[PDB]
């Protein structure tokens, strides 16, 4: 034990030295506590006469026996400071936080208790109350254990999905600090459900992935909540994440403890389309580019964020990895817990790791052009 620390710190030294030719932007910020979660808010402000734009991030804390917070931070990007705008008292670490597309003041969170919380961040003071009391705007009941998966329906305002270690997926309709019981509980998985995500176009369709190694496709119009529409043996270990391609309605991607990202076609789930290989450990997040249909990213325990270009599947080569691996981000020296593609600046990513580091970065233009 502890030779690893020498290996990591030497590799970080090579990385640091090479950033001027690998990146168009690298901002590093040390949070007071690590964040398990990261999501860019949709808004950008471009003040007249300035050399920067102002973007914003939903973050959380993970403490060891100290008061946690849901956090909104501001980031200045050039055409660059990072500041905390608000902290709201949160009961336990923030497993995951996601804004509601139809009203981005509304943020859902996953707690270490079974509760899923809803905050309207405009209804909370500037400074958190030092009493420490968590006053969520809604408490969403239905789970028996904590989890990670959290998804707002982009086509039905207020329909929230959640995945838990209790083997279940819960659905709430918040549209009517009260307690809401789950509208529907889906019980098809036989193990910890790691992630859940609505389809971006079809208001009734969602996907889940679990430690049973399965990708499941659900339809809310089905009377049978114990059996999905489709059930796919997706990976040879736990499936930790999924993400629907925002330009291609039949395409999705899953990330796994088997160290691979799988590419799927909903119309024929018996045949995995491709397996993206290069991660050296468990994958916990995968996300498609909001700007480029063929671009996907993945991160996890190997301390790397990989960016893939599926248009390069099959091309010939002289190498250090397959042709579809566009970029390896090696800026983190600990496990990466989450990342978010900036929706207003193509190729900007924010990524957060267990050693308190948040990085906002952009690979060099010549790497993708």
């Amino acid at each position: 034990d502890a030779v690893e620390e020498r290996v990591i710190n030497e590799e970080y030294k090579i990385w640091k030295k090479n950033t001027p030719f690998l990146y168009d932007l690298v901002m590093t910020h040390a949070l007071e506590w690590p964040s398990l979660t990261a999501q860019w808010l949709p808004d950008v402000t471009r003040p007249e006469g300035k050399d920067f734009s102002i973007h914003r991030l939903v973050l959380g804390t993970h403490t060891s026996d100290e008061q946690n917070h849901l956090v909104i931070a501001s980031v200045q990007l050039p055409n660059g400071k990072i500041e905390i705008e608000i902290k709201i008292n949160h009961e336990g670490e923030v497993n995951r936080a996601r804004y509601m597309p139809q009203n981005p003041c509304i943020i859902a969170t996953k707690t270490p208790s079974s509760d899923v919380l809803v905050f309207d961040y405009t209804k909370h003071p500037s400074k958190p109350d030092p009493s420490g009391e968590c006053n969520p705007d809604l408490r969403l009941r239905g789970h028996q254990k904590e989890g990670y998966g959290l998804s707002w329906n982009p086509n039905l305002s207020g329909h929230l999905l959640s995945a838990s270690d209790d083997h279940t997926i819960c659905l709430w309709d918040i549209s009517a600090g009260k307690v809401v019981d789950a509208k529907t509980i889906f019980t098809g998985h036989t193990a910890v459900v790691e992630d859940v995500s609505w389809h971006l176009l079809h208001e009734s369709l969602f996907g889940s992935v679990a430690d049973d190694q399965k990708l499941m496709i659900w339809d809310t119009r089905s009377n049978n909540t114990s059996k999905p529409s489709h059930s796919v043996d997706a990976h040879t270990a736990e499936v930790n994440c999924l993400s629907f391609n925002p330009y291609s309605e039949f395409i999705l991607a899953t990330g796994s403890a088997d160290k691979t990202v799988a590419l799927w076609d909903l119309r024929n789930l018996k045949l995995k389309l491709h397996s993206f290989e290069s991660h050296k450990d468990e994958i916990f997040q995968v996300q498609w580019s909001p700007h480029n249909e063929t671009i996907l990213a993945s991160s996890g325990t190997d301390r790397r964020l990989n960016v893939w270009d599926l248009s390069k599947i099959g091309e010939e080569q002289s190498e250090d990895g397959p042709p579809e691996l566009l970029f390896i981000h090696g800026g983190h020296t600990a496990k990466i817990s989450d990342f978010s593609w900036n929706p207003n600046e193509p190729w900007v990513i924010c990524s957060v790791s267990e050693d308190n580091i948040m990085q906002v970065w952009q690979m060099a233009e010549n790497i993708y052009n």
Binding site: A30, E32, W33, T63, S64, E93, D211, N240, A334, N356
Partner: peptide, 10 residues
């Protein structure tokens, strides 16, 4: 099922 690390301040 993920196992969260022990968080360190600063």
């Amino acid at each position: 099922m993920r196992s969260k690390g022990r968080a360190r301040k600063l």
